[PDB]
Design an enzyme around this catalytic site. Structure first.
Site, mmCIF file in Angstrom:
data_model
loop_
_atom_site.group_PDB
_atom_site.id
_atom_site.type_symbol
_atom_site.label_atom_id
_atom_site.label_comp_id
_atom_site.label_asym_id
_atom_site.label_seq_id
_atom_site.Cartn_x
_atom_site.Cartn_y
_atom_site.Cartn_z
ATOM 1 N N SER A 274 3.302 19.375 -14.746
ATOM 2 C CA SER A 274 2.247 19.919 -13.892
ATOM 3 C C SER A 274 1.163 20.579 -14.732
ATOM 4 O O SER A 274 -0.033 20.394 -14.486
ATOM 5 C CB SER A 274 2.820 20.955 -12.917
ATOM 6 O OG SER A 274 4.032 20.542 -12.310
ATOM 7 N N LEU B 139 10.282 42.779 -7.153
ATOM 8 C CA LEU B 139 11.717 42.572 -7.305
ATOM 9 C C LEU B 139 12.363 43.799 -7.943
ATOM 10 O O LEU B 139 11.894 44.297 -8.972
ATOM 11 C CB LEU B 139 11.983 41.332 -8.161
ATOM 12 C CG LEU B 139 13.437 41.082 -8.575
ATOM 13 C CD1 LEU B 139 14.305 40.756 -7.366
ATOM 14 C CD2 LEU B 139 13.521 39.974 -9.615
ATOM 15 N N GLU C 178 2.800 37.967 -0.164
ATOM 16 C CA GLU C 178 3.976 38.820 -0.290
ATOM 17 C C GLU C 178 4.143 39.827 0.843
ATOM 18 O O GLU C 178 5.258 40.325 1.051
ATOM 19 C CB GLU C 178 3.946 39.587 -1.621
ATOM 20 C CG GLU C 178 3.903 38.701 -2.853
ATOM 21 C CD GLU C 178 5.212 37.980 -3.124
ATOM 22 O OE1 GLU C 178 6.267 38.374 -2.562
ATOM 23 O OE2 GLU C 178 5.182 37.003 -3.905
ATOM 24 N N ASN D 80 2.565 16.534 -8.175
ATOM 25 C CA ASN D 80 3.648 16.890 -9.087
ATOM 26 C C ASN D 80 4.199 18.280 -8.790
ATOM 27 O O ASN D 80 5.415 18.496 -8.852
ATOM 28 C CB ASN D 80 3.155 16.793 -10.527
ATOM 29 C CG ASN D 80 4.263 16.995 -11.533
ATOM 30 O OD1 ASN D 80 4.445 18.087 -12.066
ATOM 31 N ND2 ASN D 80 5.014 15.935 -11.801
ATOM 32 N N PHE E 72 3.918 35.301 -10.958
ATOM 33 C CA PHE E 72 4.392 36.455 -10.202
ATOM 34 C C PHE E 72 5.647 36.108 -9.411
ATOM 35 O O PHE E 72 6.622 36.868 -9.404
ATOM 36 C CB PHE E 72 3.255 36.917 -9.289
ATOM 37 C CG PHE E 72 3.505 38.210 -8.545
ATOM 38 C CD1 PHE E 72 4.259 38.228 -7.387
ATOM 39 C CD2 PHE E 72 2.909 39.391 -8.965
ATOM 40 C CE1 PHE E 72 4.442 39.400 -6.680
ATOM 41 C CE2 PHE E 72 3.088 40.568 -8.257
ATOM 42 C CZ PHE E 72 3.861 40.572 -7.121
ATOM 43 N N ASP F 292 14.151 39.544 -0.560
ATOM 44 C CA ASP F 292 13.174 38.473 -0.690
ATOM 45 C C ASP F 292 13.745 37.176 -0.126
ATOM 46 O O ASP F 292 14.843 37.141 0.432
ATOM 47 C CB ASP F 292 12.642 38.386 -2.121
ATOM 48 C CG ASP F 292 13.645 37.798 -3.111
ATOM 49 O OD1 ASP F 292 14.749 37.375 -2.712
ATOM 50 O OD2 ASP F 292 13.323 37.786 -4.322
#
Ligand SMILES: Fc1cccc2ccccc12
Length: 163
Positions: free
Chosen positions: A117, A32, A11, A132, A104, A20
């Site tokens: 998955s 965010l 990040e 996948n 996250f 972002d």
């Protein structure tokens, strides 16, 4: 190597409001603020989050505090979710970090389509799960970060973050 270092790498750290990869107002270590196009709305969210009038700028200490809260919120959300918790608890610590990383980034709603998955991961079919996981908007839109997270799920090592 731990979830905080992993997400700090993925990040970055910015002390002023930025956008972002999706164009949404964000600050700190990927916090965010809002999906609204209004910068004023983002600034209000920031002030509410920090507890003072920030003018769109925070300190490193504040960014790290928000980050700790955000990581914890991802973990507790996994643990409260009847679909995610059993898979999470089946994983080793390194792969649990990869799971937190995805929550996250995309939230519980953003991972909802990852049902197949998750099944492959719970079955410990690591190569199949990696294939996948890459068949996703997530991988196509943020491929370098997704490749790191996927390598973490595939190998159970930190190799993608040391490299
Ligand atoms: F194995 C997992 C456990 C909990 C949440 C997850 C979110 C995305 C991908 C894998 C996850």
């Amino acid at each position: 190597m731990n979830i905080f270092e992993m997400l700090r790498i993925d990040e970055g750290l910015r002390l002023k409001i930025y956008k972002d990869t999706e164009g949404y107002y964000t600050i700190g270590i990927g916090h965010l603020l809002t999906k609204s196009p209004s910068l004023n709305a983002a600034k209000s969210e920031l002030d509410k989050a920090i507890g003072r009038n920030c003018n769109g700028v925070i300190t490193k200490d504040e960014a790290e505090k928000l980050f700790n809260q955000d990581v914890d919120a991802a973990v507790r959300g996994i643990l409260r979710n009847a679909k995610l918790k059993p898979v999470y608890d089946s994983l080793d610590a390194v792969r649990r970090c990869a799971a937190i990383n995805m929550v996250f980034q995309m939230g519980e709603t953003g991972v909802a389509g990852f049902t197949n998955s998750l099944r492959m991961l719970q079955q410990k079919r690591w190569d199949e799960a990696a294939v996948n996981l890459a068949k996703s908007r997530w991988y196509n839109q943020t491929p370098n970060r997704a490749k790191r997270v996927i390598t973490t799920f595939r190998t159970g090592t930190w190799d993608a973050y040391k490299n």
